[PDB]
């Protein structure tokens, strides 16, 4: 198929477009916040192999 649509940014708050994504990172302690999201590591208590997500 083919879709046409808009992405515009006038400034400060005037941001318009079809779907805004708009990720939420506040409160998350990040090394280079541009990354978005974070990694967590546990390591199994039986098998001792690492685990990450």
């Amino acid at each position: 198929y083919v879709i046409v649509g808009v992405v515009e940014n006038i400034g400060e708050k005037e941001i318009v477009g079809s779907i805004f994504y708009a990720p939420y990172t506040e409160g998350l302690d990040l090394d280079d916040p541009e990354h978005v999201g974070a990694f967590k590591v546990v390591v199994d208590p039986e098998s001792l192999q690492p685990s990450i997500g």
Partner: protein
């Protein structure tokens, strides 16, 4: 009266008072609370879901 140390049982079930003795020596007190380990923290997380 300058004699008894008065404490309030904030959670008293009815209405009462208990008079007790406590000597200057640690062995003279009827009942002995003798802590060994206190408020040792534990930490971890569950590998199936990463929740702490």
């Amino acid at each position: 009266g300058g004699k008894y140390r008065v404490y309030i049982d904030q959670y008293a079930k009815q209405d009462y008072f208990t008079v007790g003795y406590k000597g200057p020596n640690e062995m003279d007190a009827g009942i002995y609370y003798a802590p060994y380990v206190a408020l040792t923290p534990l930490r971890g997380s569950d590998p199936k879901n990463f929740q702490p």
